[model samples]
Target: AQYEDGKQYTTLEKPVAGAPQVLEFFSFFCPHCYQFEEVLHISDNVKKKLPEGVKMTKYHVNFMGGDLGKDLTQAWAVAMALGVEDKVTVPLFEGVQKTQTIRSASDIRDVFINAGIKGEEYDAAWNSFVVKSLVAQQEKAAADVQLRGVPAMFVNGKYQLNPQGMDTSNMDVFVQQYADTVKYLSEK
Candidate 1:
């Protein structure tokens, strides 16, 4: 819609490609991410729309000193670790943004519980080594990309797209902008 930023997504210094990877760096606390979630909306709708080779992943940003943000970051990491993202992610987003729940550990637990995660399942996932590892990986990734804020998207590990300075309100326009960037990089 408005590709007038004069800044196309920058190609990565080292583009790692087993398949095309599309990563979104977001926080449960970020307002813009609450909107961008429409692109996925539990369908990974954006990923589904992509060509065969592209894969999408969501990363939770874990910056220091953000109390609520810290819990949400961990909640997401554990959700992925539990392999219950399909059931939990969208609801988690809605639960936090709308109700202002999930300000504590058990609150995070309740969100997943409502989304169908059993007690033992939550226990295992929350304390799992894999969840810790994935969270660490997310931290490293944010640092690697020099992340500035949430709702940031990286295609093929190189191009960074976010609504940093641009007008970031319309989904239709954002979707079009994203498609063009994905096509530009994926076809290259």
Candidate 2:
């Protein structure tokens, strides 16, 4: 599905069930995303420290791909469908941003393989119904939200944090505060 103007790229619909959800909107090529990666370790710690009801999920936003957007979108869809998202998404982001590698579809595919995802499965899932549907949904999401940049975040689908709107010096504080906000919201 192609995106129409002024729509959300993705929707949470229902509040995350069971656990409190932390949804991050990030992009592979964003410099801020690179910087934020270090601090994201806090999230790992947060996961460990949280009571049994909280969880975290990262969503890669694909609004800028000169020619690679389609494939990248499909890759995300495939990862989500195969239930291998946790295994590959972070590595893929690190490979592209930290190493400056995986710039093309083939490179991305290799990253998937190296991450222990089967190449054949990746290929098959890449063209599967779930992947195709997600790709279409994301396209529409990008268009609807009028997204202008990356490293944005939504906390429980209620609050939005745009890096561009904040002071870079205090981003860590803001992120932690964001997490705190989620905690507060979840307890309500």
Candidate 3:
């Protein structure tokens, strides 16, 4: 998936070198993304329920702009490149959502620093090629999918789940239904 240039959304390219990749496109400032966070946690509870070889990758949409969004998106890419997605993703989200501090690049760096990441390490990772490529890729995805907003999802390469178009009122239900849809697609 690729996005148009100058757009705020990010595009994904192929699967993440694995089977059944679950790619989620989200933004930190999106209320729907906030609700989906809980749904992700719930999905974790029933990992055994998912089909084998399923891996999830989250792309943080940088539509909000400002230093906060840039920093968060960079941090997400850096974490993934550093193999620390499991370590930083949730905490970073919590830092922005729970803390009263204004979300900005500096605030994001502070969060990472508090999480035991060395300033130098974070800096290097943020500037790495992988991070840059991820950002570009997401940009293309936003364009290709013609996404109207955040918290959208894609399974494999062509599937999508936007809550506004679905009947499910709860975030969890919507997520699980999407997951189920993915499972169904995989079997076919």
Candidate 4:
């Protein structure tokens, strides 16, 4: 089924330049985001289902963990900069939410350490100018979106997906609909 703006999605206030892109607004402490990561496997599933050349960018928000939220955001930027998002994403989530092992940014560094990334490497990425820039961009995007919650997906940098229009009863159907809607929006 074809998706429509304002129905299956809504427009962004200031659309980012890149089309055929999906920007995810999430937080490590967000429960639904954890479910989306571990249970639904949204990124992996959507990545597999998306059309060729569709870019998916994830931005970790800074409103969840109180004072620690910003640190968590920075941790995410470091993970991406180190090219270890796949290695650390689930661990970070579980560490914060389920296992309750992660307390500070150092705890986050330990997750990266466990992921086979050296402490020096993680420190370098965490202190790099590139990662700092990424963290700033993530912070700005979170403010720009004026998001009300976590686990939100924006397609083509402009259209934010609205789950109300899609079937949510079945996990398979939900993900297929998500991918299909993304494809439909990307082409626009």
C-alpha RMSD values across all candidates: 3.4, 7.7, 6.9, 1.9
Off by more than 4 A, model 4: 18-20
Per-residue lDDT for 1-188 in model 2, tens only?
22211232233344333322555556666766666666555355445544566566655566666567566767888887888876776777777777868778999899889989898888889868888787776565444445577765555554444333333467666565544544544443
lDDT of 1: 0.69
lDDT of 2 at 37: 66
Top-TM-score candidate index: 4
* Colliding pairs, model 2: 1-136, 3-140, 6-144, 7-144, 7-145, 8-141, 9-141
Per-residue alpha-carbon lDDT of model 3 for 1-188, expressed as tens digits? 12221232223444333323566677666666666665455235324456877776667777775567767777778777777766665666667776646356777777678778899998888888878997877666666666667777665665554345443667567556555554654443
Candidate 1 stretches greater than 4 Å from native = 1-5, 11-20, 39-45, 162-170
Decide which is better by lDDT, 1 or 3: 1
Q: TM-score per candidate, in order?
A: 0.81, 0.70, 0.74, 0.90
The Cα error of candidate 1 at residue 177, in Å, is: 2.6
- In model 3, the runs with Cα more than 4 Å from the true position are 1-20, 39-48, 165-175
Best-fitting candidate, measured by lDDT?
A: 4
Candidate models: Cα lDDT each: 0.69, 0.62, 0.63, 0.83
lDDT tens per residue, model 4, 59-164: 8988888867888998889888878888999899999999999998888889989999999888888889999999988877766667778889987668888867
Measured by C-alpha RMSD in angstroms, how accurate is candidate 2? 7.7
